[PDB]
Amino acid sequence: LLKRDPLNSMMNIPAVLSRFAGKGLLLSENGYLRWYVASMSIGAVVVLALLMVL
Amino acid sequence: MTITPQNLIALLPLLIVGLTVVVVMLSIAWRRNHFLNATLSVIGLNAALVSLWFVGQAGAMDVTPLMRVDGFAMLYTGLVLLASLATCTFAYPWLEGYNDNKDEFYLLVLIAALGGILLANANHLASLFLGIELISLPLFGLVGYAFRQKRSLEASIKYTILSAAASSFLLFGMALVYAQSGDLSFVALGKNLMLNEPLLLAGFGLMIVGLGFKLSLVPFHLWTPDVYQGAPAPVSTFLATASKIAIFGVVMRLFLYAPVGDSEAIRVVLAIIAFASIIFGNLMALSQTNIKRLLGYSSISHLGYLLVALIALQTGEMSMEAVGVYLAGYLFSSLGAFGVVSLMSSPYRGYRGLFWHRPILAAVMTVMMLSLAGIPMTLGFIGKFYVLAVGVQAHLWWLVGAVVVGSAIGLYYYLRVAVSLYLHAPPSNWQYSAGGIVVLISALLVLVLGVWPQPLISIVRLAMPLM
Amino acid sequence: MIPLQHGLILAAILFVLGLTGLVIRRNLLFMLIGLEIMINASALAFVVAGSYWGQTDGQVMYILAISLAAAEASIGLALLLQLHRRRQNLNIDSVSEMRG
Amino acid sequence: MEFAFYICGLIAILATLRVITHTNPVHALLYLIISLLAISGVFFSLGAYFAGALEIIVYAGAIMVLFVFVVMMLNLGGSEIEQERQWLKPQVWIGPAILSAIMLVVIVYAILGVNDQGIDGTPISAKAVGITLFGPYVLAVELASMLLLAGLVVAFHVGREE
Amino acid sequence: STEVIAHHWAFAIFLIVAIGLCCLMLVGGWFLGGRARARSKNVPFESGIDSVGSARLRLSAKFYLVAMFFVIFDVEALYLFAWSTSIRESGWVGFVEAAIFIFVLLAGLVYLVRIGALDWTPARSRRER
Ligand SMILES: CCCCCCCCCCCCCCCCCCCC
């Protein structure tokens, strides 16, 4: 049961999480300019809202 | 208040760069000679670099309602001048293969260096805005220099539209701030204040949006891999080094000299932006097969580390020297890496197993890849150690945890590139040799100041502005 | 006698309309037109800010704003002429070959 | 003075809205001219006579070259309007509309939270602006000249046919 | 005072009467005179023969480079407009700043002239030989 080294896979879990998160985040770099301007506007709204709530 | 001759003595790099801009213009108009205008640009940049000594012998003075000159401005002026000199040195062998005119490149580089110097000396909102635009516009020219190539035109259009939008955002936030306070000076933001008022906070948020675009900060970071890949390699070198150095220097000047830096909400949103920038920039470069996009995400992560060093400026007094040391190390490492990329891309026509045909460039590239990872015996480790010490001193535990995680991810992809340099793959002109010497001295400086960092600490701490 | 808030609200309305024209429009010429609208709106906000305090700083910032506007308009117009010359259309969503 | 400012502001808002939601490029340029005329009227009502003067002086030439480039490429009859119409869809414009609305209401919340004393409408002549421009603000003028030179060099380098 | 509101009213009446007079003569021109009917009345005038294509073709203006230079030079002109109204109070130092500004302006103009820009005429129309 232990010959697969379960603790090694348990500690390799965050490497899989990092790979999945990086592959998910790379989908945002589609290369479209209008999406880039929309994302800049989204970030401006987000930072302004965070400044208003505090 | 009027202009004294001592003010022009302190104004030596700006006047020298403007004079050599005019001289390069007139020499281009007289005759299209690549070597003559290139030598003129290098001579002017070196003249500004050695006039920094006379600026230091003059002293620190508030030369304009706009400008203030001290060791801070001196250090950042020297950094952007070194970046511009390396950009010209890498650009000349690349420009040897350009079928079109090769003379406007050095003019645009000199004008962008002038904008960087004016950003380093900025103590006014108007100077800050003008320096940002004077960095951006020659970068619009240089990014789309090879407009026959598709990707350069793509990066030029994207950078121009996005930077015009960010300039509009920054200018609107500037106008809201000026409506709140009534003075555009860097020391009179909120002097009439109850430091939290929504109009000033919104104006500073919009300037944060603009500067975070200019510093490749999340979520205004999506342009960085595209613009870095599309642009020519010396242009990528300049955009990675000089623009980031100058804009972060003026950001630190704004956040140090203003009383608005004591506000908790701006510090909280800057911590959020720094966390997101580090994690996103490190995670996005995991599966990158292209070196330019990988270095763009690297720039995002390193600017996140600089953000972490900047957030704790109000609490500790050692944050500014940490940013100076990190920016010196980052400048040298980016110069070496992008110089190896540029020398591999020169001359312009239109890295696996690099050691077996170009061993010295492979050595420089793997040294700079070790340096960018924060590994000891290199300068990037000294910068990361300074950032971690600054974060620990002001008790920013989420930020230092993000720094550790991002450093591990950067370790993975940087060392992957480093071993790929030494696997098995399936010039002859003194300008190329000069570029090789430049990247070799960059690697040697990184190694020597990683082993023995104390002289760099002494030079950085001696660059002390008005507290 | 004229509220500063109404002028700032007018400038904000023009700025967000320029950004709406920047994002939702696909032809590059209308993105440049929207960029002109935002830079004029930020300049307008600077003039209202300078007129509230009775200073020339807002007008000088307006001058710098429209100098930047003219220079960026010329640069974007040259880039758009290049795009139309080497592509024969002004679709900005086809500029997407650089991704990932 | 309130009447002129408010009417010009309403005209500017309406003309900008008609600019960003139009398919005809020449009509869009005409509404842009109307909007900038209204902006200059707003400038004139606030006492900044030089600002409105430069808004009509230098943007009449700016939109003129925009008309030149519109004639150069965009005019093709009804085909260009038809092509521009397909790019605009109800979902396409309803997407960022709520983003622009929430940004506008956040900025309005920020604006209303500041103190007010009213703009007195005292005129500011071009003499004072010239004194401040070539007085305390030397380097803004000189490096703005260098910035415009840089933009001119970029325009020459990019805009060449061959 | 009274002179200022009198001048404002005079200017407003000048605008109103000018626009109304233009509209009135346009209406009088449109309403007076009988109309003409012809088979080829609603055809663009092209010297008496039908057109090839239409007049809505895209036309490559050769002076577009000069146009995007003209915007920049217009902004330099506005800077000199701002300077020229306050020469006496600017002093000799302000004259030095404007001399540097204008010297950069002619340096850019000589650069534009010498590199082949501001010259879009064809080789057959350059009046050589
Ligand atoms: C072919 C590619 C087309 C790209 C079009 C991009 C359009 C983006 C529209 C974004 C609209 C956002 C509306 C608000 C969402 C919620 C708030 C922001 C996220 C938290």
Side-chain angles (χ1 to χ4, degrees), chain A residues 32 34-35 38 42, chain D residues 95-96 98-99:
Chain A
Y32 291 88
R34 305 197 296 112
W35 161 243
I42 281 173
Chain D
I98 64 198
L99 188 65

Side-chain angles (χ1 to χ4, degrees), chain A residues 1 5 7 9-11 19 22 24 31 33-34 37-38 43 45-46 53:
Chain A
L1 190 134
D5 210 332
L7 299 193
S9 309
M10 167 198 138
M11 290 286 322
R19 279 200 300 270
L33 188 50
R34 305 197 296 112
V37 186
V45 170
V46 161
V53 298

Side-chain angles (χ1 to χ4, degrees), chain B residues 132-189:
Chain B
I132 286 173
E133 299 322 299
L134 204 38
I135 285 267
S136 306
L137 256 77
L139 260 289
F140 301 158
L142 290 168
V143 159
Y145 206 75
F147 45 86
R148 315 286 179 72
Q149 182 69 254
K150 308 140 280 302
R151 323 170 107 79
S152 184
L153 183 60
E154 296 188 12
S156 199
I157 291 167
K158 287 180 182 183
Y159 196 45
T160 301
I161 298 295
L162 278 172
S163 172
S167 314
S168 311
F169 259 112
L170 181 123
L171 213 45
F172 192 61
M174 280 178 93
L176 294 181
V177 164
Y178 179 51
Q180 210 293 350
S181 66
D183 189 24
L184 300 155
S185 176
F186 261 15
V187 296
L189 296 115

Side-chain angles (χ1 to χ4, degrees), chain D residues 40-122:
Chain D
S40 48
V42 166
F43 284 170
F44 275 124
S45 38
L46 297 167
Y49 295 160
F50 196 39
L54 303 166
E55 253 266 7
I56 301 301
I57 277 168
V58 325
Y59 269 108
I63 305 183
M64 206 289 271
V65 322
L66 264 191
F67 197 102
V68 165
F69 279 107
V70 155
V71 167
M72 257 198 78
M73 329 163 210
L74 282 201
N75 63 0
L76 283 148
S79 146
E80 46 103 7
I81 295 191
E82 203 47 53
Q83 190 30 104
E84 193 80 21
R85 180 176 293 104
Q86 311 285 349
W87 292 336
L88 284 167
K89 285 288 173 61
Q91 36 102 24
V92 157
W93 78 265
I94 212 70
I98 64 198
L99 188 65
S100 55
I102 191 66
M103 182 156 59
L104 185 55
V105 76
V106 163
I107 295 177
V108 156
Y109 179 176
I111 282 159
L112 293 177
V114 85
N115 83 356
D116 196 4
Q117 274 305 111
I119 304 176
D120 62 334
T122 304

Side-chain angles (χ1 to χ4, degrees), chain A residues 33, chain B residues 136-137 139-141 153 155-165, chain C residues 22 27-33 35-36 67-85 89-90 92, chain D residues 62 65-66 69 73 150-159, chain E residues 64 68-69 71-72:
Chain A
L33 188 50
Chain B
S136 306
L137 256 77
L139 260 289
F140 301 158
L153 183 60
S156 199
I157 291 167
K158 287 180 182 183
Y159 196 45
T160 301
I161 298 295
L162 278 172
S163 172
Chain C
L22 187 54
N27 220 57
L28 183 53
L29 242 192
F30 282 65
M31 335 192 54
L32 288 177
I33 286 200
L35 279 175
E36 292 303 300
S67 327
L68 165 70
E72 275 182 343
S74 44
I75 290 183
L77 242 44
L79 286 170
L80 183 177
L81 187 300
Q82 200 70 228
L83 180 71
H84 192 95
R85 217 191 314 121
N89 176 28
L90 297 183
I92 211 61
Chain D
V65 322
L66 264 191
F69 279 107
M73 329 163 210
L152 172 130
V153 167
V154 175
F156 158 73
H157 178 73
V158 173
Chain E
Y64 70 100
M68 324 157 309
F69 298 151
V71 195
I72 313 283

